[PDB]
Protein backbone atom coordinates (compact mmCIF):
# COMPACT_ATOMS: atom_id res chain seq x y z
CA UNK A 1 0.00 0.00 0.00
CA UNK A 2 2.81 2.42 0.98
CA UNK A 3 4.80 1.49 -2.11
CA UNK A 4 1.69 2.15 -4.28
CA UNK A 5 1.26 5.61 -2.68
CA UNK A 6 4.95 6.45 -3.42
CA UNK A 7 4.48 5.50 -7.11
CA UNK A 8 1.20 7.46 -7.22
CA UNK A 9 2.96 10.63 -6.10
CA UNK A 10 5.94 10.06 -8.45
CA UNK A 11 3.45 9.57 -11.34
CA UNK A 12 1.63 12.80 -10.38
CA UNK A 13 5.00 14.67 -10.40
CA UNK A 14 5.32 14.00 -14.19
CA UNK A 15 5.42 17.24 -16.18
CA UNK A 16 6.22 16.17 -19.77
CA UNK A 17 5.61 12.91 -21.68
CA UNK A 18 8.42 10.42 -22.12
CA UNK A 19 7.25 10.17 -25.79
CA UNK A 20 8.67 13.69 -26.31
CA UNK A 21 12.06 12.47 -24.90
CA UNK A 22 12.59 9.19 -26.78
CA UNK A 23 16.09 10.24 -27.91
CA UNK A 24 17.13 10.86 -24.28
CA UNK A 25 16.19 7.31 -23.09
CA UNK A 26 19.11 5.70 -21.21
CA UNK A 27 20.02 2.37 -19.64
CA UNK A 28 21.07 3.00 -16.04
CA UNK A 29 21.87 -0.66 -15.34
CA UNK A 30 19.66 -1.18 -12.29
CA UNK A 31 21.16 -4.02 -10.22
CA UNK A 32 18.02 -6.21 -10.21
CA UNK A 33 19.99 -9.27 -8.99
CA UNK A 34 20.73 -7.54 -5.65
CA UNK A 35 17.09 -7.72 -4.59
CA UNK A 36 17.02 -11.58 -5.02
CA UNK A 37 13.85 -13.67 -5.21
CA UNK A 38 10.59 -12.59 -3.43
CA UNK A 39 11.24 -15.38 -0.85
CA UNK A 40 14.43 -13.76 0.60
CA UNK A 41 12.76 -10.40 1.41
CA UNK A 42 14.11 -10.41 5.01
CA UNK A 43 17.72 -10.33 3.74
CA UNK A 44 16.95 -7.49 1.30
CA UNK A 45 15.80 -5.06 4.09
CA UNK A 46 19.16 -3.12 4.32
CA UNK A 47 19.37 -2.98 0.49
CA UNK A 48 15.78 -1.66 0.22
CA UNK A 49 16.57 0.89 2.98
CA UNK A 50 19.53 2.17 0.91
CA UNK A 51 17.36 2.30 -2.24
CA UNK A 52 14.70 4.48 -0.50
CA UNK A 53 17.37 6.70 1.08
CA UNK A 54 19.00 7.18 -2.35
CA UNK A 55 15.60 8.04 -3.93
CA UNK A 56 15.09 10.60 -1.15
CA UNK A 57 18.61 12.03 -1.72
CA UNK A 58 18.09 12.23 -5.49
CA UNK A 59 14.77 14.08 -5.12
CA UNK A 60 15.85 16.42 -2.29
CA UNK A 61 18.67 18.21 -4.26
CA UNK A 62 18.47 21.91 -5.25
CA UNK A 63 18.05 20.76 -8.89
CA UNK A 64 15.08 18.51 -7.97
CA UNK A 65 13.39 21.35 -6.08
CA UNK A 66 13.65 23.47 -9.24
CA UNK A 67 12.42 20.66 -11.54
CA UNK A 68 9.41 19.35 -9.57
CA UNK A 69 6.29 20.74 -7.82
CA UNK A 70 7.00 21.57 -4.15
CA UNK A 71 3.59 20.33 -2.88
CA UNK A 72 3.99 16.95 -4.61
CA UNK A 73 7.66 16.70 -3.54
CA UNK A 74 6.72 17.19 0.14
CA UNK A 75 4.06 14.46 -0.04
CA UNK A 76 6.67 12.24 -1.80
CA UNK A 77 9.23 12.83 1.02
CA UNK A 78 6.53 12.02 3.61
CA UNK A 79 5.86 8.69 1.94
CA UNK A 80 9.59 7.88 1.66
CA UNK A 81 10.05 8.84 5.38
CA UNK A 82 7.23 6.44 6.34
CA UNK A 83 8.88 3.59 4.40
CA UNK A 84 12.25 4.23 6.04
CA UNK A 85 10.58 4.17 9.50
CA UNK A 86 9.02 0.78 8.88
CA UNK A 87 12.41 -0.66 7.82
CA UNK A 88 14.30 0.91 10.78
CA UNK A 89 11.70 -0.28 13.30
CA UNK A 90 12.14 -3.84 12.01
CA UNK A 91 15.94 -3.70 12.22
CA UNK A 92 15.70 -2.36 15.82
CA UNK A 93 13.36 -5.25 16.72
CA UNK A 94 21.30 -9.92 11.00
CA UNK A 95 23.67 -12.81 10.36
CA UNK A 96 24.73 -12.38 6.69
CA UNK A 97 28.58 -12.37 6.38
CA UNK A 98 28.69 -9.44 3.93
CA UNK A 99 25.58 -7.82 5.53
CA UNK A 100 24.79 -7.24 1.77
CA UNK A 101 27.41 -4.43 1.75
CA UNK A 102 28.23 -5.42 -1.89
CA UNK A 103 24.51 -4.99 -2.73
CA UNK A 104 24.38 -1.54 -1.04
CA UNK A 105 27.47 -0.47 -3.07
CA UNK A 106 25.80 -1.62 -6.30
CA UNK A 107 22.69 0.46 -5.44
CA UNK A 108 24.94 3.47 -4.71
CA UNK A 109 26.75 3.04 -8.05
CA UNK A 110 23.36 2.95 -9.82
CA UNK A 111 22.31 6.29 -8.24
CA UNK A 112 25.76 7.70 -9.08
CA UNK A 113 25.06 6.93 -12.80
CA UNK A 114 21.69 8.72 -12.50
CA UNK A 115 23.44 11.74 -10.91
CA UNK A 116 26.14 11.81 -13.63
CA UNK A 117 23.46 11.53 -16.37
CA UNK A 118 21.51 14.51 -14.99
CA UNK A 119 24.70 16.59 -14.75
CA UNK A 120 25.78 15.65 -18.31
CA UNK A 121 22.29 16.47 -19.64
CA UNK A 122 22.34 19.84 -17.75
CA UNK A 123 19.19 18.88 -15.77
CA UNK A 124 17.02 19.27 -18.89
CA UNK A 125 13.25 18.57 -18.65
CA UNK A 126 13.78 15.41 -20.75
CA UNK A 127 16.64 14.19 -18.56
CA UNK A 128 14.45 14.62 -15.46
CA UNK A 129 11.55 12.77 -17.12
CA UNK A 130 13.88 9.89 -18.11
CA UNK A 131 15.12 9.72 -14.47
CA UNK A 132 11.58 9.90 -13.06
CA UNK A 133 10.47 7.03 -15.33
CA UNK A 134 13.60 5.04 -14.39
CA UNK A 135 12.83 5.48 -10.68
CA UNK A 136 9.18 4.39 -11.29
CA UNK A 137 10.57 1.16 -12.80
CA UNK A 138 13.38 0.43 -10.32
CA UNK A 139 11.24 1.28 -7.28
CA UNK A 140 8.49 -1.13 -8.43
CA UNK A 141 11.16 -3.82 -8.98
CA UNK A 142 12.86 -3.27 -5.59
CA UNK A 143 9.54 -3.38 -3.72
CA UNK A 144 8.31 -6.46 -5.68
CA UNK A 145 5.15 -4.43 -6.47
Amino acid sequence: LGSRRTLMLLAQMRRISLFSCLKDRHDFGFPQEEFGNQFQKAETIPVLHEMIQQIFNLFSTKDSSAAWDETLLDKFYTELYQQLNDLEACVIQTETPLMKEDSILAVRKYFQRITLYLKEKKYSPCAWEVVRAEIMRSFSLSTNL
Epitope: H26, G29, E33, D102, A106, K109, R113
Partner: single-chain antibody
Framework: VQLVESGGGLVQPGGSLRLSCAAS????????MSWVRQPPGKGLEWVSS????????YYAASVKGRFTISRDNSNKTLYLQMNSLRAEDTAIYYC???????????????WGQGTLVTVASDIQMTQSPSSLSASVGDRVTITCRAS??????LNWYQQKPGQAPKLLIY???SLQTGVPSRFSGSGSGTDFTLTISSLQPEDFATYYC?????????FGGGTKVEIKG
Amino acid sequence: VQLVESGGGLVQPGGSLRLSCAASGFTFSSHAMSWVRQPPGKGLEWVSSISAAGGSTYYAASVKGRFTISRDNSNKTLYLQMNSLRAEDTAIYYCAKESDRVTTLDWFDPWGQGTLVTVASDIQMTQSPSSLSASVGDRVTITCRASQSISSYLNWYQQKPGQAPKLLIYAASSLQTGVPSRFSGSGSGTDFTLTISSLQPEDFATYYCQQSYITPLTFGGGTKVEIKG
Protein backbone atom coordinates in the same frame (compact mmCIF):
# COMPACT_ATOMS: atom_id res chain seq x y z
CA VAL B 1 49.88 -10.61 -7.84
CA GLN B 2 49.18 -13.90 -9.63
CA LEU B 3 46.14 -15.61 -11.15
CA VAL B 4 46.53 -19.21 -12.36
CA GLU B 5 43.75 -20.77 -14.49
CA SER B 6 43.23 -24.53 -14.82
CA GLY B 7 40.52 -27.04 -15.78
CA GLY B 8 40.48 -26.31 -19.51
CA GLY B 9 40.16 -29.13 -22.02
CA LEU B 10 38.25 -30.83 -24.84
CA VAL B 11 34.57 -31.38 -24.10
CA GLN B 12 31.61 -32.75 -26.10
CA PRO B 13 28.67 -30.47 -26.97
CA GLY B 14 26.06 -30.59 -24.18
CA GLY B 15 28.62 -31.72 -21.61
CA SER B 16 29.99 -29.81 -18.62
CA LEU B 17 33.36 -28.48 -17.38
CA ARG B 18 34.59 -26.53 -14.32
CA LEU B 19 37.36 -23.93 -14.62
CA SER B 20 39.46 -22.79 -11.66
CA CYS B 21 41.57 -19.68 -11.04
CA ALA B 22 43.97 -19.72 -8.06
CA ALA B 23 44.76 -16.22 -6.74
CA SER B 24 47.80 -14.99 -4.75
CA GLY B 25 49.64 -11.79 -3.81
CA PHE B 26 46.52 -9.75 -2.99
CA THR B 27 43.45 -9.62 -0.71
CA PHE B 28 41.25 -11.94 -2.81
CA SER B 29 38.23 -11.53 -0.49
CA SER B 30 38.15 -7.73 -1.05
CA HIS B 31 37.91 -7.79 -4.84
CA ALA B 32 35.22 -8.79 -7.29
CA MET B 33 36.42 -11.26 -9.91
CA SER B 34 35.52 -11.80 -13.55
CA TRP B 35 35.87 -14.35 -16.34
CA VAL B 36 36.62 -12.98 -19.83
CA ARG B 37 36.86 -15.27 -22.84
CA GLN B 38 38.53 -15.00 -26.23
CA PRO B 39 37.43 -17.30 -29.07
CA PRO B 40 40.24 -18.31 -31.47
CA GLY B 41 41.16 -15.32 -33.64
CA LYS B 42 38.41 -13.17 -32.12
CA GLY B 43 38.11 -10.29 -29.62
CA LEU B 44 37.64 -10.23 -25.84
CA GLU B 45 34.20 -11.03 -24.41
CA TRP B 46 33.11 -10.54 -20.78
CA VAL B 47 31.55 -13.77 -19.43
CA SER B 48 30.69 -13.31 -15.77
CA SER B 49 31.48 -11.40 -12.58
CA ILE B 50 31.16 -12.26 -8.87
CA SER B 51 31.28 -9.85 -5.94
CA ALA B 52 33.99 -9.83 -3.26
CA ALA B 53 32.01 -11.90 -0.75
CA GLY B 54 30.33 -14.07 -3.41
CA GLY B 55 26.80 -12.79 -2.80
CA SER B 56 26.31 -10.96 -6.09
CA THR B 57 26.71 -12.51 -9.56
CA TYR B 58 26.41 -11.09 -13.10
CA TYR B 59 26.45 -12.95 -16.45
CA ALA B 60 26.64 -12.16 -20.17
CA ALA B 61 23.35 -12.96 -21.97
CA SER B 62 25.10 -15.66 -24.05
CA VAL B 63 26.02 -17.72 -20.93
CA LYS B 64 23.18 -16.86 -18.51
CA GLY B 65 21.44 -19.99 -17.24
CA ARG B 66 24.22 -22.29 -18.46
CA PHE B 67 27.27 -20.97 -16.60
CA THR B 68 27.67 -20.43 -12.84
CA ILE B 69 30.40 -18.31 -11.23
CA SER B 70 31.44 -19.08 -7.64
CA ARG B 71 34.37 -18.44 -5.29
CA ASP B 72 36.16 -19.90 -2.25
CA ASN B 73 37.64 -16.98 -0.29
CA SER B 74 39.41 -19.32 2.19
CA ASN B 75 41.35 -21.09 -0.62
CA LYS B 76 41.58 -17.86 -2.70
CA THR B 77 40.01 -19.63 -5.71
CA LEU B 78 37.53 -18.46 -8.39
CA TYR B 79 35.41 -21.01 -10.29
CA LEU B 80 33.32 -21.12 -13.48
CA GLN B 81 30.91 -24.03 -13.86
CA MET B 82 30.06 -24.42 -17.55
CA ASN B 83 27.00 -26.54 -18.39
CA SER B 84 25.26 -27.26 -21.75
CA LEU B 85 28.49 -26.39 -23.57
CA ARG B 86 28.17 -25.29 -27.21
CA ALA B 87 30.68 -24.88 -30.10
CA GLU B 88 30.19 -21.11 -29.48
CA ASP B 89 31.87 -21.57 -26.05
CA THR B 90 35.22 -22.58 -27.65
CA ALA B 91 37.70 -19.99 -26.32
CA ILE B 92 40.63 -19.19 -24.06
CA TYR B 93 39.14 -18.33 -20.65
CA TYR B 94 40.89 -15.72 -18.51
CA CYS B 95 40.13 -14.79 -14.92
CA ALA B 96 40.70 -11.14 -14.01
CA LYS B 97 40.71 -9.18 -10.75
CA GLU B 98 38.43 -6.17 -10.58
CA SER B 99 39.55 -2.97 -8.82
CA ASP B 100 36.45 -2.78 -6.52
CA ARG B 101 34.39 -5.10 -4.27
CA VAL B 102 31.52 -5.01 -6.84
CA THR B 103 31.39 -4.75 -10.63
CA THR B 104 30.77 -1.65 -12.84
CA LEU B 105 32.72 1.63 -12.83
CA ASP B 106 35.95 -0.39 -12.51
CA TRP B 107 38.69 -2.19 -14.53
CA PHE B 108 40.36 -5.59 -14.94
CA ASP B 109 43.86 -5.88 -13.44
CA PRO B 110 45.66 -8.19 -13.42
CA TRP B 111 44.65 -11.07 -15.73
CA GLY B 112 45.60 -14.76 -15.59
CA GLN B 113 47.47 -16.67 -18.31
CA GLY B 114 44.23 -18.28 -19.58
CA THR B 115 42.97 -21.83 -20.09
CA LEU B 116 41.75 -23.30 -23.40
CA VAL B 117 38.22 -24.76 -23.60
CA THR B 118 37.42 -26.58 -26.85
CA VAL B 119 33.88 -27.78 -27.56
CA ALA B 120 23.16 -9.39 -26.66
CA SER B 121 24.17 -6.12 -24.81
CA ASP B 122 22.37 -2.86 -25.49
CA ILE B 123 25.75 -0.90 -25.24
CA GLN B 124 27.68 -1.44 -28.48
CA MET B 125 31.41 -0.53 -28.51
CA THR B 126 32.76 0.37 -31.97
CA GLN B 127 36.53 0.57 -32.45
CA SER B 128 38.09 2.28 -35.47
CA PRO B 129 40.06 1.37 -37.47
CA SER B 130 40.00 -2.49 -37.35
CA SER B 131 43.72 -2.49 -38.32
CA LEU B 132 46.36 0.17 -39.03
CA SER B 133 49.90 0.18 -40.45
CA ALA B 134 52.49 2.38 -38.77
CA SER B 135 56.26 2.92 -38.64
CA VAL B 136 58.47 3.31 -35.53
CA GLY B 137 58.14 6.95 -34.43
CA ASP B 138 54.64 7.50 -35.86
CA ARG B 139 51.76 8.97 -33.86
CA VAL B 140 49.00 6.36 -33.57
CA THR B 141 45.36 7.22 -32.81
CA ILE B 142 42.68 4.60 -32.05
CA THR B 143 39.04 5.62 -31.47
CA CYS B 144 36.28 3.91 -29.50
CA ARG B 145 32.61 4.90 -29.76
CA ALA B 146 29.84 3.83 -27.33
CA SER B 147 26.16 3.49 -28.42
CA GLN B 148 25.09 5.53 -25.37
CA SER B 149 26.89 7.78 -22.85
CA ILE B 150 29.17 5.79 -20.56
CA SER B 151 30.55 8.91 -18.67
CA SER B 152 34.36 8.26 -18.32
CA TYR B 153 34.05 4.48 -17.66
CA LEU B 154 36.22 3.24 -20.51
CA ASN B 155 39.42 1.19 -20.18
CA TRP B 156 42.14 0.40 -22.78
CA TYR B 157 44.06 -2.88 -22.99
CA GLN B 158 47.10 -4.01 -25.02
CA GLN B 159 47.32 -7.62 -26.24
CA LYS B 160 50.37 -9.09 -27.98
CA PRO B 161 50.12 -12.28 -30.14
CA GLY B 162 49.90 -15.40 -27.97
CA GLN B 163 49.72 -13.33 -24.76
CA ALA B 164 47.02 -12.28 -22.27
CA PRO B 165 45.72 -8.65 -22.33
CA LYS B 166 47.38 -5.95 -20.18
CA LEU B 167 45.74 -2.79 -18.76
CA LEU B 168 47.12 0.46 -20.24
CA ILE B 169 44.54 3.09 -19.27
CA TYR B 170 41.60 3.07 -16.86
CA ALA B 171 38.70 5.57 -16.39
CA ALA B 172 39.25 6.98 -19.95
CA SER B 173 42.50 8.88 -19.15
CA SER B 174 44.27 7.41 -16.09
CA LEU B 175 47.61 5.83 -17.06
CA GLN B 176 48.36 2.48 -15.37
CA THR B 177 51.55 2.26 -13.22
CA GLY B 178 54.50 1.10 -15.32
CA VAL B 179 52.92 2.05 -18.66
CA PRO B 180 55.18 4.50 -20.62
CA SER B 181 54.16 8.18 -20.87
CA ARG B 182 53.87 7.89 -24.70
CA PHE B 183 50.41 6.29 -24.11
CA SER B 184 47.52 8.62 -23.29
CA GLY B 185 43.74 8.39 -23.21
CA SER B 186 41.04 11.02 -23.67
CA GLY B 187 37.27 11.47 -24.04
CA SER B 188 33.93 11.32 -22.20
CA GLY B 189 30.31 10.40 -22.97
CA THR B 190 30.35 8.46 -26.25
CA ASP B 191 33.70 9.25 -27.96
CA PHE B 192 37.08 8.05 -26.68
CA THR B 193 40.67 8.01 -27.99
CA LEU B 194 43.91 6.10 -27.27
CA THR B 195 47.04 7.92 -28.49
CA ILE B 196 50.62 6.63 -28.78
CA SER B 197 52.70 9.81 -29.32
CA SER B 198 55.72 7.99 -30.83
CA LEU B 199 55.31 4.27 -31.68
CA GLN B 200 58.04 1.91 -30.42
CA PRO B 201 58.86 -1.65 -31.66
CA GLU B 202 57.32 -3.13 -28.49
CA ASP B 203 53.97 -1.37 -29.19
CA PHE B 204 52.97 -3.52 -32.21
CA ALA B 205 49.97 -5.27 -30.65
CA THR B 206 46.10 -5.44 -30.78
CA TYR B 207 44.41 -2.73 -28.67
CA TYR B 208 40.94 -3.07 -27.13
CA CYS B 209 38.57 -0.61 -25.45
CA GLN B 210 36.12 -1.79 -22.74
CA GLN B 211 33.13 -0.08 -21.12
CA SER B 212 32.70 -0.59 -17.38
CA TYR B 213 29.60 1.68 -17.05
CA ILE B 214 26.99 -1.14 -16.69
CA THR B 215 26.63 -4.96 -16.95
CA PRO B 216 27.13 -6.73 -19.27
CA LEU B 217 30.64 -5.30 -19.52
CA THR B 218 31.59 -5.12 -23.24
CA PHE B 219 34.78 -4.84 -25.32
CA GLY B 220 35.41 -3.18 -28.69
CA GLY B 221 36.28 -5.21 -31.80
CA GLY B 222 39.98 -4.51 -31.44
CA THR B 223 42.55 -2.58 -33.48
CA LYS B 224 45.64 -4.37 -34.76
CA VAL B 225 48.69 -2.07 -34.92
CA GLU B 226 50.99 -3.56 -37.59
CA ILE B 227 54.24 -2.69 -39.39
CA LYS B 228 54.23 -0.48 -42.51
CA GLY B 229 55.73 -1.66 -45.81
